[PDB]
Amino acid sequence: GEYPTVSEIPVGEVRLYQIADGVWSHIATQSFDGAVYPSNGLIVRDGDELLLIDTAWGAKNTAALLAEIEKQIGLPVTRAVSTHFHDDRVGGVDVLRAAGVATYASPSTRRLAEVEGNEIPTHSLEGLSSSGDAVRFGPVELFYPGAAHSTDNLVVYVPSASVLYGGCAIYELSRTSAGNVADADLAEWPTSIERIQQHYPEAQFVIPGHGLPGGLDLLKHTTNVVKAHTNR
Ligand SMILES: O=C(O)[C@H](CCCn1c(-c2ccccc2)n[nH]c1=S)N(Cc1c[nH]cn1)Cc1c[nH]cn1
Ligand SMILES: [Zn+2]
Ligand SMILES: [Zn+2]
Ligand SMILES: [Zn+2]
Known part of the structure; x- marks a missing residue:
């Protein structure tokens, strides 16, 4: 269909978009500095489970992503990878971890996250x-x-x-x-x-x-x- 924009997405909500068989983007919005910007992550089907690429940017957005996955795909997210150490990609790692997702990032990401005082994905x-x-x-x-x-x-x-x-x-x-x-x-x-x-x-x-x-x-x-x- 038509790719979701900030228009079709209430802040605090998450839309999924099917790019291909067993591939989706997740789109969330965040209000920073007066403006509203969208943010993409990936979801990839892995047998009967799901690999998640990046958080939906924030603990509350991330909890809404999991709910929205539970609703639209109904397969469990077992692993998550953060592509960089900024809060838009690791913010919500604790939510993921609490729901039983194994969280991963490179040592270089984990180091900078730690230095930044951000949430730190568990696995290297x-x-x-x-x-x-x-x-x-x-x-x-x-x-x-x-x-x-x-x-x-x-x-x-x-x-x-x-x-x-x-x-x-x-x-x-x-x-x-x-x-x-x-x-x-x-x-x-x-x-x-x-x-x-x-x-x-x-x-x-x-x-x-x-x-x-x-x-x-x-x-x-x-x-x-x-x-x-x-x-x-
Ligand atoms: O790239 C930017 O600077 C930002 C997006 C920030 C998202 N982000 C952040 C981030 C930003 C705020 C809080 C936590 C993390 N880290 N890395 C990235 S990418 N916006 C707004 C902006 C500020 N200065 C110039 N632009 C750019 C943007 C992307 N899409 C729509 N607007
Ligand atoms: Zn960044
Ligand atoms: Zn970003
Ligand atoms: Zn583990």
Whole structure:
């Protein structure tokens, strides 16, 4: 159908969107700093259970995500992966943990989360410490492209559906300016996106951390925006 926007989503609520067989995005909204912005995560079917990529941003949003999963899919979320250490991706980890979800992130993510005073996913993902590293995690591949929006950002690929979840390292087409880039490596960002490009040239669906999915041109768009900001 039509991809959900802040319009179709009351703040505190979560919509699911089916991208492919056994793949969904989860879309939530958050009011920051006067404005309302949407946020995407992923859900991937793993036999008779569910792998969750990223929290719905907050303990209350995350509890609403689980309820909305329990309602629309009715399969249990057994594992969750946070793609970076910011609160929009780990906020709700405690809720997940209380519901019996095993929470995972790279050591680099866990370290920064700890330093940040954020919630810390329980389990460590080994083998992602070097730019270009990939590891399998059930029905997805996890990929560390190098520093971009943050030094720890991961991307997620669903081989079975050619879905690339970029997380916050990839911007939607609508987004004309770099956001908060305080934690970013602007100097390495484009090289990291090129790694993503070179590793997943067959991706059919590209999901940005925020906003509307597209194809692989989201990667060039983000390059273009990051480079204009570098040049500001
Ligand atoms: O990228 C940005 O800076 C933000 C989105 C912040 C989401 N976020 C956060 C975050 C932001 C607030 C609280 C906790 C975590 N960490 N990493 C990311 S990505 N907005 C609003 C903004 C502030 N400055 C410039 N833009 C950008 C946005 C995305 N989609 C719609 N707006
Ligand atoms: Zn972030
Ligand atoms: Zn465990
Ligand atoms: Zn984000």
